[PDB]
Amino acid sequence: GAMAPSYRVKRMDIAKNDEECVVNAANPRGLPGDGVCKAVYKKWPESFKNSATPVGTAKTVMCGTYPVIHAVGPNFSNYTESEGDRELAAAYREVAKEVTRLGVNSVAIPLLSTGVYSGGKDRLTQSLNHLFTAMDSTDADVVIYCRDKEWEKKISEAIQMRT
Ligand SMILES: Cc1nccn1C[C@H](C)O
Ligand SMILES: [Cl-]
Ligand SMILES: [Cl-]
Ligand SMILES: [Cl-]
């Protein structure tokens, strides 16, 4: 565990993280994909051996000794708001189980289903609150990665409001 488990946010490429493991915003087929998934594929391509897993689940594959947790959020183009909400919550619960199982002291996480799986909606608050519901019972240091300046401010505000 971390001595004083924390949440932080950084605005940069998650492929340059300073944590003990990474969560990939994966597709269900273990394909190189786009966005976070493509950056992860370029940095840790070995982690895509048998990484395919269903929506709402997480599957960890080692790149050397560095764990890549492939977490599959729903594509809100295909799911109803109700069913997508359930699968997005479930993917984060599976991330918390994997982080715990691995015994890491820190984890780099993106906001699942906020990019090309968002169905064209702003899901910062929805995705971040499912992240908190899952990760709050873990004692890893959690570092949330984003790319947008306004999202960085809103994520930082949400972290600070609870402290
Ligand atoms: C910044 C923003 N606006 C809508 C959605 N997002 C996040 C994705 C990842 O670009
Ligand atoms: Cl960067
Ligand atoms: Cl996405
Ligand atoms: Cl972002």
Side-chain angles (χ1 to χ4, degrees), residues 11-13 16 147:
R11 182 183 83 99
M12 54 183 281
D13 185 355
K16 301 171 184 198
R147 300 302 299 267

PDB file of all heavy atoms in Angstrom, residues 11-13 16 147, ligand 2:
ATOM      1  N   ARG A  11      -1.887  16.102 -16.931  1.00  0.00           N
ATOM      2  CA  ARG A  11      -2.266  16.315 -18.330  1.00  0.00           C
ATOM      3  C   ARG A  11      -1.053  16.017 -19.201  1.00  0.00           C
ATOM      4  O   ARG A  11      -0.190  16.886 -19.424  1.00  0.00           O
ATOM      5  CB  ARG A  11      -2.845  17.719 -18.553  1.00  0.00           C
ATOM      6  CG  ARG A  11      -3.281  17.944 -19.989  1.00  0.00           C
ATOM      7  CD  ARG A  11      -3.777  19.365 -20.147  1.00  0.00           C
ATOM      8  NE  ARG A  11      -2.641  20.228 -20.363  1.00  0.00           N
ATOM      9  CZ  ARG A  11      -2.250  20.652 -21.566  1.00  0.00           C
ATOM     10  NH1 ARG A  11      -2.885  20.263 -22.652  1.00  0.00           N
ATOM     11  NH2 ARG A  11      -1.224  21.456 -21.670  1.00  0.00           N
ATOM     12  N   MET A  12      -1.014  14.795 -19.717  1.00  0.00           N
ATOM     13  CA  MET A  12       0.108  14.276 -20.545  1.00  0.00           C
ATOM     14  C   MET A  12      -0.264  12.865 -21.001  1.00  0.00           C
ATOM     15  O   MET A  12      -1.272  12.287 -20.526  1.00  0.00           O
ATOM     16  CB  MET A  12       1.421  14.217 -19.751  1.00  0.00           C
ATOM     17  CG  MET A  12       1.324  13.426 -18.441  1.00  0.00           C
ATOM     18  SD  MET A  12       2.901  13.450 -17.436  1.00  0.00           S
ATOM     19  CE  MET A  12       3.804  12.226 -18.358  1.00  0.00           C
ATOM     20  N   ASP A  13       0.576  12.342 -21.873  1.00  0.00           N
ATOM     21  CA  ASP A  13       0.468  10.980 -22.420  1.00  0.00           C
ATOM     22  C   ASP A  13       0.713   9.950 -21.316  1.00  0.00           C
ATOM     23  O   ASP A  13       1.835   9.925 -20.740  1.00  0.00           O
ATOM     24  CB  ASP A  13       1.446  10.840 -23.569  1.00  0.00           C
ATOM     25  CG  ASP A  13       1.380   9.533 -24.323  1.00  0.00           C
ATOM     26  OD1 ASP A  13       0.603   8.623 -23.907  1.00  0.00           O
ATOM     27  OD2 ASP A  13       2.082   9.469 -25.379  1.00  0.00           O
ATOM     28  N   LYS A  16       3.943   7.855 -20.781  1.00  0.00           N
ATOM     29  CA  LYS A  16       5.106   8.427 -20.060  1.00  0.00           C
ATOM     30  C   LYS A  16       4.858   8.426 -18.533  1.00  0.00           C
ATOM     31  O   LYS A  16       5.576   9.171 -17.821  1.00  0.00           O
ATOM     32  CB  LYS A  16       5.359   9.873 -20.522  1.00  0.00           C
ATOM     33  CG  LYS A  16       5.648  10.119 -22.014  1.00  0.00           C
ATOM     34  CD  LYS A  16       5.651  11.633 -22.318  1.00  0.00           C
ATOM     35  CE  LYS A  16       5.821  12.047 -23.775  1.00  0.00           C
ATOM     36  NZ  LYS A  16       6.248  13.476 -23.925  1.00  0.00           N
ATOM     37  N   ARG A 147      -5.824  14.770 -21.373  1.00  0.00           N
ATOM     38  CA  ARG A 147      -5.083  15.562 -22.395  1.00  0.00           C
ATOM     39  C   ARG A 147      -5.629  16.998 -22.533  1.00  0.00           C
ATOM     40  O   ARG A 147      -4.890  17.858 -23.099  1.00  0.00           O
ATOM     41  CB  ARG A 147      -5.125  14.810 -23.730  1.00  0.00           C
ATOM     42  CG  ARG A 147      -4.484  13.423 -23.670  1.00  0.00           C
ATOM     43  CD  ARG A 147      -3.027  13.375 -23.240  1.00  0.00           C
ATOM     44  NE  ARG A 147      -2.083  14.101 -24.089  1.00  0.00           N
ATOM     45  CZ  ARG A 147      -1.392  13.558 -25.097  1.00  0.00           C
ATOM     46  NH1 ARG A 147      -1.545  12.281 -25.396  1.00  0.00           N
ATOM     47  NH2 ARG A 147      -0.531  14.289 -25.781  1.00  0.00           N
TER      48      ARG A 147
HETATM   49 CL    CL B   2       2.893  14.422 -23.279  1.00  0.00          CL
END
